[PDB]
Amino acid sequence: AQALNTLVKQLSSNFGAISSVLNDILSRLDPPEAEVQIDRLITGRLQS
Amino acid sequence: QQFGRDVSDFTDSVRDPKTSEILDISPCAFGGVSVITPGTNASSEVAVL
Ligand SMILES: *[C@@H]1O[C@H](CO)[C@@H](O[C@@H]2O[C@H](CO)[C@@H](O)[C@H](O)[C@H]2NC(C)=O)[C@H](O)[C@H]1NC(C)=O
């Protein structure tokens, strides 16, 4: 149960990127720089 | 209140701003697909799961 928590806590971590919600980097920044910060969320979540 | 959250911070329930109806939000659907086969020499038909 603590593994499934620890996986699911870190949905909320930004991993140093802009925001833990994708739509807030989608709707609010430039789609070039939106690609930058979601690619930091994609790899950071993929390490977890 | 206007909306609710699950055990995460994901939003699961919403008060409808047009009629104050309390709604719930399911996941749409997803899941895994498994294929069951008797083997290629004996047959070439499958069931899915
Ligand atoms: C939006 O508001 C209107 C009124 O501002 C709602 O109409 C009322 O609906 C209730 C429930 O059927 C009735 O008791 C009232 O007589 C209605 N009033 C009027 C002036 O029509 C309407 O229901 C609201 N929208 C939704 C989707 O519920």
Query: What DSSP line would sit under B15-45, residue for residue?
Result: E-TTT--EEE----------EE-S-TTT---
Closest CA to B9 of A18, A33, A8: A8
Cα angle for residues A33, A41, A29 (degrees, 5° grid): 25
How many angstroms is the resolution?
3.9
Ligand 1 atom nearest to B16, measured from its CA:
27
What is the Å distance from ligand 1's center to B15 Cα? 16
Elucidation method? cryo-EM
Rounded distance, CA B8 to CA B3, Å?
14
Pairing of strands B35-36, B3-5: unpaired
Give the pocket of ligand 1 (CB within 6 Å).
Answer: B 18-19
Contact A8 B9 (CB under 8 A): no
